[PDB]
Amino acid sequence: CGAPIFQPNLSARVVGGEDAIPHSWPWQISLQYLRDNTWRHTCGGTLITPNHVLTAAHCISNTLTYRVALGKNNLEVEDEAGSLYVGVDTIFVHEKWNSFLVRNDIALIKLAETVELGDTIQVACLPSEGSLLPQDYPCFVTGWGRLYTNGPIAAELQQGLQPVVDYATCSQRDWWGTTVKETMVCAGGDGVISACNGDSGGPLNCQADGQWDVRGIVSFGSGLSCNTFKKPTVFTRVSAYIDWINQKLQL
């Protein structure tokens, strides 16, 4: 379960969207599509079994051909020793996913190969069904940025902290109003330069008496202002989808 051989950080010292200790969140994967010959990353995801990645629903286009990239830190490389690229077998998108309302932004990627599960490929931990974490709780949104796009990319795997914002808070009319639903986790705090470090469908990492649990999948924000005050990053509540996850995990 969610235990790394490369200790990441915490609110240690680095100010601003920290790069990231090469390989300190080994369940971080990059979802890529082919165009001509080059593969390009669009979304992030989480390794959760030696052949299944949890990811956002809005990251799936029925027409594209995908590949999953494992064990990376710098996207502009193709070796990094402990790295991989695995084809997809099936992508089960939640049958109630709703694009207009952006409700149930979830999808499970059944890989096609065993995925070596080595020293830099590690499986994060799934929360407990129902877990509704305390407001202000420290969590980390990893990712290669690619969310708001217009800013010096992020070939270097990023990572930055996000403080769980309680539903009661998010749902405030002057916050994310009705948009939000108890099935979503909010996060993100008053920034400082901000710089969107997590990608769409990126993981919302949190510790649970040691090990880390995937509490969220990145879903939405403001467009131009990732980390606007009173406009937090909305993620999908993995805990609210443990039965579904467990039902599709066996398909």
């Binding site: 599509y33 165009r35 390009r40 799936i60 286009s61 029925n62 027409t63 594209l64 796009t149 217009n150």
Partner: protein
Amino acid sequence: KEDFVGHQVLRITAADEAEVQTVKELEDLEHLQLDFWRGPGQPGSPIDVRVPFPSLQAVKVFLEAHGIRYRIMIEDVQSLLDEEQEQMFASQSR
């Protein structure tokens, strides 16, 4: 498809009617192939224009020489279009 590598959108600001007639005296110049995104109006309002690469330097010095202020809003139009097009592809399905 159209080529826009190196083109630039500039934000001209004609302080007063005078500065306005001179940016218009550049509009008559058909050979420049200016694409006015926010053509000339009342002074004070912004004048956004895409000036092709070959007419790039000549337009600037024209401006500079007339003591007319402009800043570069978009540095390379093809690169934006290139992003847009890349997003669309990344997001295609039926």
